Assembly symmetry: C4
Homo-oligomer: 242 residues x 4
């Protein structure tokens, strides 16, 4: 009896069917506009509840097989946190709408159901993991970039923030404009040149910020290149020996 239910759960079909189910939930979410139709909203929402119930049947079948060993594997554990959030959230969203800004934000909880398309599917799972593994080597370079931003963010508010509060009022505004100056999005035409009307020697803060930022950025990417080449030459080196 149970060996047939476990045969079906720990199956080549079952995985492919759950992948398919998530893919179709994504399609029922992809067909959402601003229009929309008071009817369409009632239509789409129910097809999602058709999914939420099937995805709770999905984890109930999968918790039946693993009993308490389900909590051990974080994959099984993630699928459970996604399922509880879909449920806790769909009822929270229905509740809010019945009695504003919160409704559209709270309605986000549905993303976990389709986010499982990086998790539940292998090949993708592999690329997500192999990419995440880069971050710790960068964590030092990342930390200095954050640390450098604080010095400049304290300076910007101090220096310009009086006449330019729209960009450098609080350290919050200051951090944002600097990141934008860093991404080089309208740094001059939009931010530095109008600053040079009030303060002609404003570039003395931004031109070096651009240089310092770009330098740290260049070294970060180069470190990933060289870290990939360090492990590549390591296997190449021992092969040569004999």
């Amino acid at each position: 009896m149970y060996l047939r239910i476990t045969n079906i759960v720990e199956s080549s079909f079952f995985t492919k069917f759950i992948i398919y189910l998530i893919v179709l939930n994504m399609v029922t979410m992809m067909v959402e506009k601003e229009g929309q139709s008071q009817h369409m909203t009632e239509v789409l929402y129910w097809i999602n509840v058709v999914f939420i119930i099937l995805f709770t049947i999905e984890i109930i079948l999968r918790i039946y097989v693993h009993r308490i060993s389900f909590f051990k594997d974080p994959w099984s554990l993630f699928d459970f946190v996604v399922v509880i959030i879909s449920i806790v959230g769909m009822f929270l969203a229905d509740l809010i709408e019945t009695y504003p800004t919160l409704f559209r934000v709270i309605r986000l909880a549905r993303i976990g159901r389709i986010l499982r398309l990086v998790t539940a599917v292998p090949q993708m799972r592999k690329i997500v993991s192999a990419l995440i593994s880069v971050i710790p080597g960068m964590l030092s370079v990342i930390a200095l970039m954050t640390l450098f931003f604080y010095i400049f963010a304290i300076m910007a508010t101090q220096l310009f923030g009086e006449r330019f509060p729209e960009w450098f009022g609080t350290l919050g505004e200051s951090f944002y404009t600097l990141f934008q100056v860093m991404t080089l999005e309208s740094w001059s035409m939009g931010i530095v040149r109008p600053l040079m009307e009030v303060y002609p020697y404003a570039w003395v803060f931004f031109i070096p910020f651009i240089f310092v930022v770009t330098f740290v950025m260049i070294n970060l990417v180069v470190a990933i290149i060289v870290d990939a080449m360090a492990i590549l030459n390591q296997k190449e080196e021992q092969h040569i020996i004999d």
Copy 2:
């Protein structure tokens, strides 16, 4: 008329002369403007018909020398699709002109004869396939980047698709702005800063979107290097034997 032609087609004269015919068909396609002059349109359209005729003459000679073995080659197969699409397009466009916006959309079939420059030039052939061989390795990273775009796209409509339909109303409408924000083109001054007039904490969607997409970007570029470094080191590894 099969004994002498078999050797003239597989000659330096025939391949160089046919490459010359393409260059001359590019120049005639270039000397087109918005102007234009109806006489200039009639003259240029006729110069093209001569080349469309000449390139048909070319493929007939190429078919009846290689007999059926012509169709084995995917390159000769392409050069054949080029002439049929050119001939079909020639009359398809003319039928519409004689009997407005569809006429422009159809007329780009003329590019087929000009696209042959990469495939026909035996060196341009090489640089193209050297770039093609890169893509299989990238396919993993792309698929993940595509899916991340979908999640961020479904979110953008749900969050800001209502009040800002010009950039986020539809899924595809949202997909476009996310690509514009990815290329970092006017992401802050033109999109995120005006979005924060309505939604003050909108930056907590776009800055985390920037990082997610840029990290994946860096890694793809880094991957193209490592993939090509396995080429330098492998021809060096076999050389280090003697």
Copy 3:
């Protein structure tokens, strides 16, 4: 004598405690608002006074325990130059605040407070490592940086000549032309903002800016390739050493 002090200053706890103060002084420098109110501005000013005192006390112990070693160490003198800057600044900014003179002189002079905070790139370890491993790169690309500046001159001497007459706001001065050519280099509004309105007056302006972008991008790409090949030289020239045995 003084061995109990020699154990406090230059230890593990004391080393860590100074980081804690540097970090706590950053958080009070993070309370900078657009407002700000006569109360809050003076409140913040006084909190910093306390920190400046603590940091002067901090360098007093440091130079006493390592009497001759202070001058030999470069990082030990940085924390000293910062102390003498923080002290000079404190009263120099106060002098301009008391004697009501240009907020422009005050806002610029108050920028000495930053020294107390940029100590985090020094004082806390691994941060000193990263910043030093980054600074070590700067010479192994200094010729490319030098070539770039020279390339910028030649191009700025040209831009002021050609476009400077009808476009003074962007190219009227060599200082104006050094700015615009830098903006064009970062590709920010290069065409729409500068090269396109220039073509309204001088339609063959692109013949200068398209090659400028090219000449200036090639030098840039190679500067980054130089950082890679020099990093991959330390790896490659040690790889050979092991292979030899």
Copy 4:
């Protein structure tokens, strides 16, 4: 008699440290005068600056005539020495040709173009000072390999440029009117400067499926570009793997 004493004494002056370091000084000194010309600026300041430059023009002519008698046809075989002479003949022609257009006040627009000859004098700074000529030659040695990717990139621009003019040429002649116009706008779109907020979005009011031409263009160009930058790395790693190779042979 010999007779050859002076032509072996003058080579000790021309092929020395002082001369070389002094000629590098003269170019730097000629740069600062060219640097101080701006917005406008009286005919006094303009004549003052013009005369300082004439002095500099003859100063480099004596320098090349010194090298002319010493190295002779051995200077001709050197490209850096040949170019130095080309600069001199340009800084002289230019000096007169610009003055001619100033005397007979016909074409004030052609004047600023011809007057650009003066840049040859300070253009020589990268080739004169060593280590700068080193890197210049090192960068110049990167472009030959790179050449085939560039040739492909150019071709991709020709096919995309004949396409842009064909489609959005009638309603938007401002950007894609002529073939040459399309080349510029597609380069702007490639460099990503206001590609959407400025060009692809307004184009979508008229032709709403216009992005189907630009998104692939932005992909294709960026794909060829990345591979070009990656090629520079592989062109550079050809040096490292070969020097290491012979060392391991023994």
